[PDB]
Design a protein around this ligand. Structure first.
Ligand code: GDP
Ligand code: GDP
Ligand code: IMO
Ligand code: IMO
Ligand code: MG
Ligand code: MG
Lengths: 431, 430
């Protein structure tokens, strides 16, 4: 009994937007604590409940549950204006008293306005220099994580202690950035004044995260859910570097982002989209830039929530999925957006990569290889039926069931949930 | 199914607890010894058969010829330093090392200009705020900073198209010259050396994720993970900003090797019988008096190689409890017990008081630690030489009580007790 309760984790198995918001929301209906451990508002998690659609970024998807406490861990990078802008957008949607059930770890870093600006600048510069950038969301994520590593970045506890010292620190950080980009513009006083206001507003929600999570896991039994952001193949260490985000999206980030040891990690769910999508620049072996790709974008609404920019779509790729499983060790899968495939007569899924007719042994650490590989596909018969109303395993048509099995079998992990729709009820639990 | 679990050795305080000594001892029956985070800012001493080694990038297990040393993807590597370290040990007998050393191809590269920029930033800090971090000036902070920026270059990039590697190298070096127009950088010179290192290292490089995954799912093997730096030096959980730039805690094992938590077995906390730290930053139990001089002297607490004297103080349970909360230590290795062989009494910090009132947990704001008053418990010393102890019964009654004390106050069993620098100078209790 020395260990304590174990947290349940929801992670992205591909390149993001797999449906983490939907899955977390489903599992949070009876959770005591729902939390974020890494990333920032570069993430976007859609939740649909009772004909009401929510859009979360920094707020844990469970913020909807009024009887649960939403928690932002030390691994997350916070942009205060964005944080509150997100809250008010959702307030106008029925979200009430969120500030009373939201706890923020005082060790989390802060994304300053100039971090986002420098993100835009680097992106543009890298574009006019090497004719290709990363495709960042420009939310200042990379620069803030860069400031973290340098130990020059500022944290929540800093913003809450003596403001005079915080200002001095802020100014210094600001300068070091204007040096980086002499073109960078920073109204230090205007931003410190806004930050002064955010401090007051955020003060009552702040707490020591390490202690908060410890007590939660070692006192009376509680259900703790951890919502990962971004995805396995976007992981700073294991993704398609450098075309990745700047945090660990894989399982390890749960430990480093909340300060809990491995023995306090229970079920780890891998959310896998029935087909593959990507947003920024980077290799994408199964990318269909054709009628099929167009059919998946439209049927899957694959485009930026505010930007409208269409996401790149492709067939399910088992190579990245098995690789993702190697690092995350999923205990079960959530196969989402199956209904998208209701219209195809046949479905292709990549089973391996080839170079000179021979299957390569493992996923390439060098991104450039992925561009030179030939994807070996297997063609499965479609079900040409509406699974949208399916609520139980038996309601799925033979070819749909077979599709699910194909995923389980080849990954070596059992499918626990099948998504057939955007809303919370549009789900099938297999066990 | 799940596969075998790795054994982990982590620093529980502010570094230099004797991780090298522990890893060397455990590596005797290990098939694979690996590093998961950090770089050569780390310094680990191994003492065997009248030979004293000091490793930095090479896993402490490199000494065991029948085992495979592995450097994971979380480590930042400085090629020049790597081979200089390998050569300094070759002159000590380390032979065929390049035959039992594998390098993960996702590990990042610490370039010469990263080391220069490190000291440059450190010298600038001291000029502005008249206070810097206390970095080892090995460029670990700047390299990790480039990684997060996805601007840094990796092992696999080095061994791929060199023309490509060169252009990226150049852009990277320029961006750093903007940071400090004072910075030089002999681009062609450095690129030239790198092209050479590329080949020298190429045969040792492999895919880390696959290498480790197969090692844990194939024929049963014993994997040992050597941590670097320490819990209170953790980029997330340490005394930020006075910390190193990588996760020194257990989670770093997962991010630095690509293995899930279910493949993590025993996690050992190396805790020195007294506390030390080198560099700037709060140190609540620090003893700037005759006591400190005695610990530093008897404990030879001075720069492994950097040459900087370490700050010393009494054992501190506040930082050990906090470290445990984060690392989930399954057992402890209490080192340098023999340093206390002469003390009549030994104080141990049990809690911190702020304005006369105890605080509930270790503070996120390092500035608070700067004002706390430590509450001590004074224990009796044994005043006898324990250097020759090889068994629990060899320890005098009061030395045993010191061990139990630590074990009872932490709720974690002490599995090893160090009584000397050498490998045999250890007592296994469990
Ligand atoms: N039709 C359909 N849409 C789904 C399903 N699961 C999720 N979605 C939608 O697909 C999108 C997933 O993107 P996003 O919300 O960014 O996922 P996240 O970033 O992983 O949380 C959302 O708009 C969801 O409403 C499903 O099973 N069927
Ligand atoms: N006398 C004595 N010295 C020890 C003992 N354990 C370790 N040491 C020495 O303490 C020092 C610890 O520094 P270091 O090697 O940097 O530790 P690491 O960085 O944690 O591997 C080394 O010089 C060791 O030889 C012990 O039980 N007794
Ligand atoms: O520096 P960044 O702004 O993080 O961008 C770097 C790279 O990461 C990708 N990316 C970042 N967050 C993403 C997301 O999050 P969720 O799955 O949580 O909704 N879903 C999809 N792609 C995402 C971007 O497309 C880009 O290539
Ligand atoms: O950017 P860095 O060069 O990492 O310096 C930042 C801070 O971290 C400390 N530090 C870093 N590695 C250390 C080490 O490692 P081992 O226990 O593995 O031998 N032992 C002790 N102190 C160590 C430095 O003294 C400094 O205050
Ligand atoms: Mg999204
Ligand atoms: Mg050391």
């Amino acid at each position: 009994a020395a260990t304590g309760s174990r947290v349940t984790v929801v992670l992205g198995a591909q390149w993001g937007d797999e449906g983490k918001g939907k899955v977390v929301d489903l599992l949070a209906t009876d959770a005591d604590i729902v939390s974020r451990c890494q990333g920032g508002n570069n993430a976007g998690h859609t939740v649909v409940v009772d004909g009401k659609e929510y859009d979360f970024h920094l707020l844990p998807s469970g913020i909807i549950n009024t009887k649960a406490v939403s928690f932002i861990g030390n691994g997350v990078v916070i942009h205060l204006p964005g944080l509150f802008e997100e809250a008010e957008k959702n307030e106008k949607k029925g979200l009430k008293d969120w500030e009373k059930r939201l706890i923020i770890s005082d060790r989390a870093h802060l994304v300053f306005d100039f971090h986002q600006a420098v993100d835009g600048l680097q992106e543009v510069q890298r574009q006019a220099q090497e004719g290709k950038n990363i495709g960042t969301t420009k939310k200042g994520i990379g620069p803030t994580y860069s400031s973290k590593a340098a130990r020059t970045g500022l944290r929540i506890c800093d913003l809450l202690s003596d403001f005079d010292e915080f200002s001095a620190r802020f100014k210094n950080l600001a300068h070091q950035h204007q040096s980086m980009f002499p073109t960078l513009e920073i109204d230090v006083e205007g931003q410190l004044k806004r930050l002064k206001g955010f401090a007051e507003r955020i003060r009552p929600m702040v707490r020591d995260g390490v202690y908060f999570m410890y007590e939660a896991l070692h006192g009376p039994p509680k259900k703790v859910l951890v919502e990962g952001a971004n995805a396995a193949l976007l992981d700073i260490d294991f993704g398609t570097y450098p075309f990745v985000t700047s945090s660990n999206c894989t399982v390890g980030g749960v430990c480093t982002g909340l300060g809990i040891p491995p023995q306090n990690i229970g079920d780890v769910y891998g959310v896998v989209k029935a087909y593959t999508t990507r947003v920024g620049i980077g290799a994408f072996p199964t990318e269909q830039i054709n009628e099929i790709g167009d059919l998946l974008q439209n049927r899957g609404h694959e485009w930026g929530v505010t930007t409208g920019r269409k996401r790149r779509c492709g067939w399910l790729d088992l190579m990245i999925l098995r690789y993702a499983h190697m690092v995350n060790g999923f205990t079960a899968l959530a196969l989402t957006k199956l209904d998208i495939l209701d219209v195809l007569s046949e479905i292709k899924v990549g089973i391996s990569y080839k170079l000179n007719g021979k299957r390569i042994p493992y996923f390439p650490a060098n991104q450039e290889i992925l561009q030179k590989v030939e994807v070996e596909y297997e063609t499965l018969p479609g079900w040409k039926a509406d699974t949208t109303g399916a609520r139980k395993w038996e309601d799925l048509p033979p070819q749909a069931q077979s599709y699910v099995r194909f995923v389980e079998n080849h990954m070596g992990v059992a499918v626990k949930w099948v998504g057939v729709g955007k809303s919370r009820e549009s789900m099938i639990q297999l066990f």
